[PDB]
Amino acid sequence: STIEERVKKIIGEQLGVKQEEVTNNASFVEDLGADSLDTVELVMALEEEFDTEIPDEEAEKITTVQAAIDYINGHQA
Amino acid sequence: STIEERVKKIIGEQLGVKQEEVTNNASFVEDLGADSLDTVELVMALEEEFDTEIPDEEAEKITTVQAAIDYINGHQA
Amino acid sequence: KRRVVVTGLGMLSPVGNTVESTWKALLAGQSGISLIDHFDTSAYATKFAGLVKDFNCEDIISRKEQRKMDAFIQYGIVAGVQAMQDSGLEITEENATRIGAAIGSGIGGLGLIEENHTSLMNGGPRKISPFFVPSTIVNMVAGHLTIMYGLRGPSISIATACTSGVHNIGHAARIIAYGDADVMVAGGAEKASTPLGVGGFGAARALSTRNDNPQAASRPWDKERDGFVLGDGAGMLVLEEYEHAKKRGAKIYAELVGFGMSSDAYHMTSPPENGAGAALAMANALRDAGIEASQIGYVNAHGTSTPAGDKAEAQAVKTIFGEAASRVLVSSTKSMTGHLLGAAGAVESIYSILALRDQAVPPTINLDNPDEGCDLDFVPHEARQVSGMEYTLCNSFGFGGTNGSLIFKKI
Amino acid sequence: KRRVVVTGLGMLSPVGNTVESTWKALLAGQSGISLIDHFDTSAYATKFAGLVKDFNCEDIISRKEQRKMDAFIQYGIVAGVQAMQDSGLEITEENATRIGAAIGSGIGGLGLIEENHTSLMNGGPRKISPFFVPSTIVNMVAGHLTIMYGLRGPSISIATACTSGVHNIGHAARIIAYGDADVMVAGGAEKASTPLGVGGFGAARALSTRNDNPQAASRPWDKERDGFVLGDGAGMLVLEEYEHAKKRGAKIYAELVGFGMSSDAYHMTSPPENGAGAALAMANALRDAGIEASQIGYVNAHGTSTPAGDKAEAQAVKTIFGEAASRVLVSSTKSMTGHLLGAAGAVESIYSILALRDQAVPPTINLDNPDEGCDLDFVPHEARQVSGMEYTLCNSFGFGGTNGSLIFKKI
Ligand code: NA
Ligand code: NA
Secondary structure, X not given: OOHHHHHHHHHHHHHOOOOOOOOOOOEOOOOOOOOXXXXXXXXXXXXXXXXXXXXXXXXXXXXXXXXXXXXXXXXXX | OOHHHHHHHHHHHHHOOOOOOOOOXXXXXXXXXXXXXXXXXXXXXXXXXXXXXXXXXXHOOOOEHHHHHHHHHOOOO | XXXXXXXXXXXXXXXXXXHHHHHHHXXXXXXXXEEOOOOOOOOOOOOEEEOOOOOOOOOOOOHHHHOOOOHHHHHHHHHHHHHHHHHOOOOOOOOHHHEEEEEEOOOOOHHHHHHHHHHHHHHOHHHOOOOOOOOOOOOHHHHHHHHHHOOOOOEEOEOOHHHHHHHHHHHHHHHHHHOOOOEEEEEEEEOOOOHHHHHHHHHOOOEOOOOOOHHHOOOOOEOOOOOEOEEOXXXXXXXXXXXXXXXXXOOOOEXXXXXXXXXXXXXXXXXXOOOHHHHHHHXXXXXXXXXXXXXXXXXXXXXXXXXXXXXXXXXXXXHHHHHHHHOOEEEOOHHHHOEOHHHHHHHXXXXXXXXHHHOEEOOEOOOOOEOOOXXXXXXXXXXXXXXXXXXXXXXXXXXXXXXXXXEEEXX | OOOEEEEEEEEEEOOEOOHHHXXXXXXXXXXXXXXXXXXXXXXXXXXXXXXOOOOOOOOOOOHHHHOOOOHHHHHHHHHHHHHHHHHOOOOOOOOHHHEEEEEEOOOOOHHHHHHHHHHHHHHOHHHOOOOOOOOOOOOHHHHHHHHHHOOOOOEEOEOOHHHHHHHHHHHHHHHHHHOOOOEEEEEEEEOOOOHHHHHHHHHOXXXXXXXXXXXXXXXXXXXXXXXXXXXXXXXXXXXXXHHHHHHOOOOOOEXXXXXXXXXXXXXXXXXXXXXHHHHHHHHHHHHHHOOOHHHEEEEEOXXXXXXXXXXXXXXXXXXXXXXXXXXXXXXXXXHHHOEOHHHHHHHHHHHHHHHHHHOEEOOEOOOOOEOOOOOOOOOEOOOEEOOOOOEEEEEEOOOOOEEEEXXXXXX
């Protein structure tokens, strides 16, 4: 359905926010009320959704919605 | 190693008795100090040891060492 | 001496999602046992349980937070919120350090234990959810409830298998009477109707296998009983020091006057016979309350519908009551709800309290033919109306484990 | 008022399989952390833990009965037998109803939970062992110990995660002081160093990942700390009413004079800051013992070597002690043993007692560079000799959960 809609949807379900609030510049902790374990569970959901392994050193750099969009985009090749 | 030695060994390990005491006429509860859950675990060990399924209606009839010997013998065919 | 009263009730049970709806269904003799359908029971010897129907906690627990909770945690939170709302207690910064909890469970979060271990064996430890531990351990019902209401007083979690319900309630009263708290929310929660649960208790040959008629499977003291029936749910009580409750004009259901404990000192595979452990816990509760056994009007029995345990319980009632054994009313609400395990003592304490309020006793349904030596008034089939009842006794017995007894007094 | 004394000690720890061997190793600053080898840790971010080495219980528990017990149950039984043997208590039919237990655990039988669920997913429910439930639930340590010694008094099992140790010991003293028992064996046991355990706590990012140097990973209040280290073991104490112990000429290690409880009312993902919950539990223990904080000579801290929790604990000690904060000795034996979770409070109560007997304080090893604001005397590197110490304080803090504090008095 495009990966951005899929990524934004995953973030929406994980953090319990409407898709209206899942903006590209949104910070998981600062804007969407996620704690440190919420972001861990969120990265796991991205892995299971796209059948890709995200190294935890790269997972820590996924702080915003745009970051998760960029990672799943540039790792399907 | 013959199934009788294998069966007698399984009974010996399960009920914590030396192979000297695992006689053919020995009753699990009356002679070898097994409670009702010990005999259940023992029948499970016989199943896993011989890769055979023992219906629980037939498992209840396995009360002595000779009974377990007879069942594993006449069900390898 | 600081007295302890009950000022709030909350409950989720196989026969209702509130206290009053459950109490109405039990007095009507309604069964809450049905066939399991949330997992394939084709390979399971027991295919039925006492399930919480139509459970919707979205107004209390968001979907995001539900995923961090096993079903037994969701049940205890909902029942805890009901009890807190029923108490009308206003938590401030001043009294927060004087309010705590005593909430336990017998088996805990089997469902999410199964799920996290399945992910582990399929994808290694990187598939385990970070919320695995806090979603499964039995103490997280109190953990969430203390956070939701800002409770800072003493909080414990007693996990003593089928006696966790009365132990948590009884030691909540001990904490209040000792002076460490003025209010405590106590009880238990359980959701063992899972593959590991039904399979685990079924492996121990403890469960009834009457799959052809589940509503008649739980038959305490009946000659055709063949094991207990699993039941899910949660029971919560708000315990409060008497003068504290009176000053704030609280509603007062009953007073907790006695709490007794004992141990059996034998395995469940050994004969219980006369149930000396059960009698010892009841005697300690009577001594703690300072009343004679003849003053007890109703006894909410353990009565799990197991062959040996039911008979041993009837003997323990005969020992304690003696001459008055023929007059006291005994009944097992597990005949309708099933065995709620760690929450059984909690929901059954609520029944013993409501029995005082309404002067009515719920029945032991499915008691078609009592066993030899089970000649007590077990209130079979239909509920009993009583009058002038001042004391009720709530029992949780291990018959191979610990025992707990609570005595409640009207007003 | 009934006073409660300690008359028996038993312990299994990563640095010794007896009380005295552990106490000697801790005073020598010996680490008990090593690499895990009983399962493949290649895919695990944390590959080390505080393990019980050279464990042999065949003289106490037969191989047949061991298969019905998770490793944490075997540990608690062995430690319980040691404590019972150390007490020299002679159980008769007369005093059996006055002897009980209060033994808990934080996570329980993970090992046999994993094994039974693996059999389930591979062969259905008919592969679950009939002993699955009694081999995994946290209350079975007390269950076995009561049966082994014929104990019939009150028995409970408090499971409050990292604070189970002090809660079980503290409420055992409450049960004795209330009058429901004269002797209680209390403590906890843990064996979480399993795939689900190391993976579960590792999924929550709680564990240190210093696989290149495990003996330096647990460094409470050090600037390079990165999480706690798992530790297995069990600690058991025989608590006894004072006059009961004196009449039988019992050996008396110390008197339990204070027990305090509190709740944090916030999740572990939220900042603890000043640790108001930890301070509240310590203040309740001081009020319960009726002593000032300046009379405490040594504080066995929680000190799990976590970044936020360690700093919040130092602030709570500053709040309680105030002027005397610069003089009191604080130390985390978790720097050597690791975090024994539900058993941490139990083994650390034994350390606080032995600190009174020998007038020596074990160190906080690996404290190379303390953090800003961690300017307390944490007894770094080597043990401290003291004199005239009358009171010690044993703390278990949740920093997102419950808290427990115990105060012991010499003789
Ligand atoms: Na009952
Ligand atoms: Na400590």
